[PDB]
Amino acid sequence: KTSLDIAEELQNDKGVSFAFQAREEELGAFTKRTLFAYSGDGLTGPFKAPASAELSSFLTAHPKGRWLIAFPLGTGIVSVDEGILTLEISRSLPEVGSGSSFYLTE
Amino acid sequence: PSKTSLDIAEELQNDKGVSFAFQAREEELGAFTKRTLFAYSGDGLTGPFKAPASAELSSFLTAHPKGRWLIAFPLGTGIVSVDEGILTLEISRSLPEVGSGSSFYLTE
Amino acid sequence: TSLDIAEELQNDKGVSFAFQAREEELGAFTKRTLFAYSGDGLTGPFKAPASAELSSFLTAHPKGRWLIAFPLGTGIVSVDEGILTLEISRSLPEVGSGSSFYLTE
């Protein structure tokens, strides 16, 4: 059922930190991959931080090559490039809070 | 042991090639049961999405206390309903990309 | 494996919410998620007595409250002396469902 369930804390160069969880679930013919993201901090601009090789692999796997994600106060896109995660945001966020983004594939 | 008593998924496509994956899950939490609809599309939606659903998905969708599913996507809001095995998703605004979202209810 | 608290709260005006509070372990990480559902509308804040167990769970958030997105607006859930308060960003003709979590190690 659940074949991957990993979590890690990432921090950018100015001390903003995020917890990310990557979950993979098998549902008969379908596989579901969910990215969960949490930060108590605000973001003025994009969040860029080194990510584990395993989280990077998971992020790369998305059919869109990136992860559109809703937070309470705005929208983000999560991507990875050479082990650096980037979360770009639609507007500055005084607090990020929590959100998730998934896809299903068969 | 698992709390998940139902976990089904299916892919729907409309006459215009837009496609959605839907997952229906039921989780038993003692006195309460949660039923969740998960929806995903990489496509945009100009207007409502209509496609045939399985008998199982249709039954799950019908069971909601409101008779339909208010659902948040990143760029707008939808209502998912079913009528004679045709699923309809109506959207609040046109969406350049739908992305993912979920809608649940809890019942005792 | 996950641990859940679930209950239905009602205010003095008949608005009802269901809450599920889930705790999950992911190695060095703990994830706590609050799930909230109401089919009702809300003009202003929802206030109702909550169980000691839900109150305890709610208090554990590092921010001391739960920023939560519903389809039509944002809320903050807090607890004070076993009374749950959900404050909302704008009036909601229908609350719907939403969830709020944190993960910490």
Residue numbers in the entry:
A (entry chain C): 239 to 344
B (entry chain A): 237 to 344
C (entry chain B): 240 to 344
Task: Give the article text.
When the structures of the fibre head monomer of the different crystal forms are superimposed, no significant differences in main chain conformations were observed. When trimers are superimposed, the r.m.s.d. is less than 0.5 Å, suggesting the orientation of the monomers in the trimer is also fixed.
Trimeric fibre proteins protrude from each of the twelve vertices. Despite the low sequence identity with other fibre heads, the topology of the beta-sandwich is identical to that of known adenovirus fibre head structures and contains ABCJ and GHID beta-sheets (the E- and F-strands in the long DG-loop of human adenoviruses 5 and 2 are absent).
